[PDB]
């Protein structure tokens, strides 16, 4: 996985050493860090539901298409607008992890990875995903490091998909 | 493998959740104590051939069956073997330590190794007075109030113990 | 190299990766611990001889062996015991690039690499060196961070030595 | 590769000398104005693909030729590895700014790139026109006053324009 | 591997036999209703992504369980993995079709599979129900009367659910 | 590239074979469905216009947002209605190539490799091309042979961006 | 093994492809092939006795001394020509099934491999096997494709041999 | 590689262009005299290794310093070898043949070859010599009016000569 | 693996024991009748391959079921297979015998052995036969009186069949 | 090659190793069989001629065919008879070597490697070579060690063809 | 392991041969030598104990700190003085082993090998064994081939320990 | 590679000449003489590292530029190497002298070495130097009367002298 901790382990155990100061300041930028990424975490899950609902409606707005285009790709329906918020949601829910981790790492390992082919194959547009992450970002009110690392790992999910 | 902070994660995806406030104000908790963590690792790892050899040499004297001619760390190779061993094992304790998650010790270090020995005729529980003896040394030093800024550090003492009597327990 | 922003580097770098959060991590870890670092290296180079000459003599004197056995690898002479000086002023002089570029790296690239293979072939013995860094350790007179660090340095020339 | 500080060293070791307190005050310099520099980084990171992406397709208005039928980045393959290049040019540059030094750029990604371009038949006036249109983008992003701070930022500015610039160079 | 001919080759080989008259005439058949048999490997491959694609759809609707948080299609690497082999299942179907024999499908990509699900965790019997999914949806598109020379396609169609079913015992 | 010629001799020059009969049947195969091929060429390119006007309406019918949304990636304007047709213009193209060839070669070679970079790339979404694709095999009138391999290869571009 | 339909299947795979209209053709190759083919193995099996006699007793024509040294890898006794017979009877059956199969695989698979070590180990000239095929090429009296298709494995065999 | 029919698309599409049916009409022609090409590449590879073997021969007979001890086909090792080459020429020319096109002969085979002769010491103009002589006896095997429908094979000649002679200059 | 020498020399060194001058002057023997056993290794080696040949034609005739078609050394890959496995096991008896140790054919040649042929489908029982006739020719090879010094080779002679005996048992 | 001396330096040079006490056996080895290979060496040199023509002659006894069959790979003309001197004056120029160079390396370097090839290529016949061999052994008239190690050399060649 | 005879068999098998003339007069070499060799282990065994002592001895001569700084590195106790003899007398019994085999060999595997990181884990100095060998060399009181060879493995030690 | 004899054998090879019996005379003359090569392989060999080590010492007292930070042999790492350049030509010089032939040093080893220096900036005249001295202490340690039997060594290290030249020169 990709955090500071883990990989700090991981080079040092590929390189077949123990762990020496550069591993230290590592775990010192990690757990100084820490502080502002929890207290991120903490605000964005209590905003959770108005965040997703939010975004999910940006995106139906810069997007009318997809709240009535027939097909199962779209949220013209019940089914297809709780697919939209569920995956709004795992978005949101995946930058929490990274903040608590300190990394992308869980959002590489749960969500980037394979998504290109979930997109082709079930004819979702990163375009529509874009705009949600778009909002949150507008929207999460966070403020200092908390913002910056948090915008991050936002921006992360737009480049992955663009 | 798993750090403290993603093995909470790890758990909380696989029931969809995001953490609970209890959680994260227990990440935070280790979080204000790890400057604690880091000198241990600190420590250990500044002392780390002085924690082998002195074991390995306190083992052999307990155990003069090893080194006799025929035993298992006879022969320069065996030996060398030997002491590579239980430098490994020291190794990954201080790994687990600094993540403050067992696994990197579990995944590369110990799973498998109770095998190997079987395989090889290396008494196992041989190995495990060696990770004992280290384990004891290895917290004398990190308890050691001298050059430090006074404080508590049992529980952390603790956990390094836990470490080590995984390792123990898995070559037993 | 071994130092907290190259590695950061590399580990991107061979992932294909554009830097993230914990590379960024890192580098507040580095930096912070620099303030230390830096004024760490001033110290021990404002005291450079006193702590040479004084290693140089305790190594003479928990091996007095040293300063009158005859041949090359002694310092029964002049030559041997400014040559004695020398290694421990390169010791110490890697110490304080250590505490620069924070991390061994300069140490294992300049002195630790092939190490083992010089004091076999000169007969140099591990021992006295050990000896010349325990000396440096008790007397550099540094405190906090700045000691820590340093200390690091120093007794990983010693593992690397035993 | 170096970064900042390894740089002075291996100068400093080639000389045999330990590092004089005026190279000393000039590190420390570099390490009071870090967090500013670890803003670029994570702006130009946040914006990688709008900073190709835009560049790219205003490159390609400038110069059809180049994406005319029968121009360098005609078909998928080629147009794919243009962006391609985009990308691993900005990347690099990322990574100069991060350790606060050039060789990694230089090495890595610009030393022998001239001679590639020349043998596939790829237009390096170009590429350069790329990154220089790559650079101003990636400039306003950095020096945007909103949502930061207020400092100055300018010797760093000048320093990624340095960056940017090596680069262009290396395939004009 | 054996197609269709290579197969009895090789059974007549093992006994030092020249082909039967009957033999031979068994594969003229085969060849005389060649044409459907490439109808249907085209027919199905120029169908392969919406194959997949609802049949999967249809799977995870019916076993929600698949893709809540914490079931072996949850996560876009394992969803992706998941598509992809369902992709795979029917790619050597293809082939079988295409050869007129089981084998190619049989050692390249079933033998084995159990054993590799079992080991991961997935749940085999629910491959087969995407399997089953796809063999449906096949047969439908290869019996589609549009389009082409009316004839009676019944055996084939016989045989390519045979192969199917084959794919879906292997998993069960 | 995928023909039947070329593809029966690099089998061949992988196993340091001479060609036998088998890359002589390959041959057969492609020198009779060459009969076909040809002429479905010929007629597709006698169309070419009336194909690309024709799909491209199809497209901006099913997809009207694209006729209308500002930003470079839609065709609200002369210059993306030229680039859409140029596209689609492009995709047949590729179509008559592959006849020309008897094999998707030309269309992996020229379009089909590197495509899933640039949609993401440039936000252009594959189910507007599918469109496009699905008007031309109802509308190129071909029949027979020449039919079902034209509709081999439209159906291939379909897969390949599904 | 090397066959029409197996190879196209081979490169497939190999590829991660799904097959297309090369393969397809390819298919078609072998299909029309096939029926010059099956004609060709069943007027070869029908004159196997004839073909096979005839043969050897070509080969004991141009090479006398073959009926008369003493010696296992002779045929101057029962037991030798009877071996004789058989091996040119194994040629014969692997034309057969190169003809069923459309390919030299069942001749590469069960008789060609290996060939060279069994000559040279029990001291048989490959110069009296090619004598035998040459028989049978000028005496099978097929005509048109199936004709050249079996000289064709006959030639094949020859230059194996030499 | 290129086969006829790609060579001619590869260079349409540098153009943009579909093919002209001027274009069209000459590959016409080529599939249309087709069987004549099958049967030239069936004709010299059914006679590759007498063409080989009697070129080698006659070349020796000419030239016997290539294998007086000393010259560069004495040892068996460089008999072999050479041989070997005759053979793979050969091999290549019947390639370029069935494709109708040089690509896999120039790109595979000849290309590099000069320099590889030149850096072995072998003699190139003796190699051409080989060549040429398959050449001859090639044609002669193809333009062999028994056992075939009569008809006029003169452009294919033409066409088979031109790969052997370009192999031939290859090596001069 | 041992010679004569490491064989006694490894066993000491587990006891951590000289050898006894009993042990030296065993060895001293054995060297003394070395020119008898470097005799035995070249005239095997020297009739290799009409000892192989002579022992397969032969069990061939005794065992026809081997080679009429669908018996395992029927068809050339495995006729040419079974013969390599004659000269193989040859190859390492002779090795035992110039080393003076059956360790060379025990751990490189039979461990193992018996399960790959069981795995095959080969009969061992079969092989053993084999290995029964290259055993009685070899002897009378090794025993030949003509053109050597005259001499007593009988405890050799014993060794020798002791290593047949070995890889006979070794598969049966 | 495989000589004693240049396998003894080249295991050493694979092993990075200087050499020792194990290599310098070898030498030993070498040294004091060279008195008995050299003399041997000399004495097939003088007989050449003879044991050329002898061989020459027992091969064409033993094989009256190849004095009389047309073609080239036989000896019924002057051309064939001097083609089939030459080659077995290489076995024995071979044979030479080896004496002197002390191992088969000089025979596997310019002779054996690649003669399957020939043979085949050329159809001769390897039993034809084992008779000049076998002629050779029974008369070169060497005795003692001389006579031992060059028949090794001549069995060799011999199982090589066999 | 390194000695004539498995060496000769090990590149034999390396290289799918059987053994020649070239092994053989490996063997020739071994044998010849193995006179000397074991009359030579025979004299150092005799004289083992006498030989370890008056070792020791020489090395506490040279080196009089060893018998006298506390620590379990040296030989002030008689614990210390007892593994120093233990490692003389393993030094001694491996010369001789290697006489016996004719090789380096069971030194380089029960004792070379591993070595380095014995003497510099337990602070043991090269310099005290490499004297101990020199006293063998000088009193072990061989001659001829049997000091010769005896000597080669007592500088092999040393050249290993330096 | 070649020694002695299959350098001879080699040129004779390519007249396609058995040896005059002059030539073989001349490798009698050598063989004769070949215990007191062993005796230089053994004696060169058994000094290796003092050989090397002193050579090395003078070397850098000579010329402590190359020992002063900035110079080539500063720094673990390089000094090392510079340590291993040394014992490795020494290492191919006492092979050409075991082997009697120049080949093994030169293409292994001198061959390419003039160019690699070059490249990395060592000097080469230094290198010559080093080699120098090895040259002479080798010589003086060959020729000691001390333990030998006595004779005249002369030619042989007239021969030595020989190939440390050709290794000085090749850096030079
Ligand atoms: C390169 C692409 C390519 C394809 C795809 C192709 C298909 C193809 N299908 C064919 C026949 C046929 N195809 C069918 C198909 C069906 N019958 C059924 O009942 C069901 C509904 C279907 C298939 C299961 C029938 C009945 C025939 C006539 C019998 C025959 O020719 O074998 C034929 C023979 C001639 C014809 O009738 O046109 C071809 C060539 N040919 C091509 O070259």
């Not at chain 1, 207290?39 to 707005?61: F, H, M, P, R």
């Not at chain 2, 250990?44 to 001619?69: D, G, H, K, M, Y």
């Not at chain 2, 035993?71 to 304790?93: F, H, P, Q």
């Given at each position: 996985?990709?955090?500071?901790?883990?990989?700090?382990?991981?080079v040092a155990?590929?390189?077949?050493?123990?762990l020496?100061?550069?591993?230290?300041?590592?775990?010192?930028?990690?757990?100084?860090?820490?502080?502002?990424?929890?207290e991120?975490?903490?605000?964005?899950?209590?905003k959770?539901?108005?965040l997703?609902?939010?975004?999910?409606?940006?995106?139906?707005?810069?997007?009318?298409?997809?709240?009535?285009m027939?097909?199962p790709?779209?949220?013209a329906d019940?089914?297809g607008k709780?697919?939209?918020?569920?995956?709004?949601?795992?978005?949101?829910?995946?930058?929490?992890?990274?903040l608590?981790?300190g990394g992308?790492?869980?959002?590489?390992?749960?969500?980037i990875?394979?998504?290109?082919?979930?997109?082709?194959?079930?004819?979702?547009?990163?375009?529509?995903?874009i705009?949600?992450?778009?909002?949150?970002?507008a929207?999460?009110?966070?403020?200092?490091?908390?913002?910056?690392?948090?915008?991050?790992?936002?921006?992360?999910?737009?480049?992955?998909?663009? | 493998?798993f750090?403290?902070?993603t093995?909470?994660?790890?758990?909380?995806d696989?029931?969809?959740?995001?953490?609970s406030?209890?959680?994260?104000?227990?990440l935070?908790?280790?979080?204000?104590?790890?400057?604690?963590?880091l000198?241990?690792?600190?420590?250990?790892?500044?002392?780390?051939?002085?924690?082998?050899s002195?074991?390995?040499?306190?083992?052999?004297?307990?155990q003069?069956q090893?080194?006799?001619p025929?035993?298992?760390?006879?022969?320069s190779?065996?030996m060398?073997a030997c002491?590579?061993?239980m430098?490994?094992?020291?190794?990954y304790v201080t790994?687990?330590?600094f993540?403050?998650?067992?696994?990197?010790?579990?995944?590369?270090?110990?799973?498998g190794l109770r095998?190997?020995?079987?395989?090889?005729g290396?008494?196992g529980?041989s190995?495990?007075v060696?990770?004992?003896?280290?384990?004891?040394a290895a917290?004398?030093?990190?308890?050691?109030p001298?050059?430090?800024?006074?404080?508590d550090?049992s529980?952390?003492?603790?956990?390094?113990?836990?470490?080590?009597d995984?390792?123990?327990?898995?070559?037993?």
């Amino acid at each position: 996985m990709k955090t500071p901790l883990t990989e700090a382990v991981s080079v040092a155990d590929s390189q077949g050493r123990f762990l020496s100061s550069t591993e230290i300041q590592v775990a010192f930028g990690r757990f100084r860090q820490a502080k502002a990424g929890l207290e991120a975490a903490k605000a964005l899950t209590s905003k959770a539901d108005s965040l997703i609902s939010g975004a999910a409606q940006a995106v139906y707005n810069k997007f009318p298409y997809t709240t009535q285009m027939q097909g199962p790709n779209y949220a013209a329906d019940q089914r297809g607008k709780d697919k939209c918020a569920r995956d709004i949601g795992y978005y949101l829910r995946m930058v929490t992890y990274c903040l608590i981790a300190g990394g992308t790492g869980p959002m590489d390992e749960y969500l980037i990875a394979g998504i290109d082919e979930i997109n082709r194959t079930f004819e979702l547009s990163p375009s529509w995903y874009i705009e949600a992450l778009k909002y949150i970002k507008a929207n999460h009110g966070l403020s200092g490091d908390a913002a910056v690392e948090a915008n991050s790992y936002l921006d992360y999910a737009i480049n992955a998909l663009s | 493998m798993f750090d403290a902070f993603t093995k909470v994660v790890s758990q909380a995806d696989t029931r969809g959740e995001m953490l609970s406030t209890a959680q994260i104000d227990a990440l935070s908790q280790m979080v204000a104590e790890s400057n604690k963590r880091l000198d241990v690792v600190n420590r250990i790892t500044s002392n780390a051939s002085t924690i082998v050899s002195n074991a390995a040499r306190s083992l052999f004297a307990e155990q003069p069956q090893l080194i006799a001619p025929g035993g298992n760390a006879y022969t320069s190779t065996r030996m060398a073997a030997c002491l590579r061993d239980m430098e490994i094992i020291l190794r990954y304790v201080t790994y687990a330590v600094f993540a403050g998650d067992a696994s990197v010790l579990e995944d590369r270090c110990l799973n498998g190794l109770r095998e190997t020995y079987l395989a090889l005729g290396t008494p196992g529980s041989s190995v495990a007075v060696g990770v004992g003896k280290m384990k004891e040394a290895a917290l004398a030093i990190v308890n050691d109030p001298a050059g430090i800024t006074p404080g508590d550090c049992s529980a952390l003492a603790s956990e390094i113990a836990s470490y080590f009597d995984r390792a123990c327990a898995a070559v037993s």
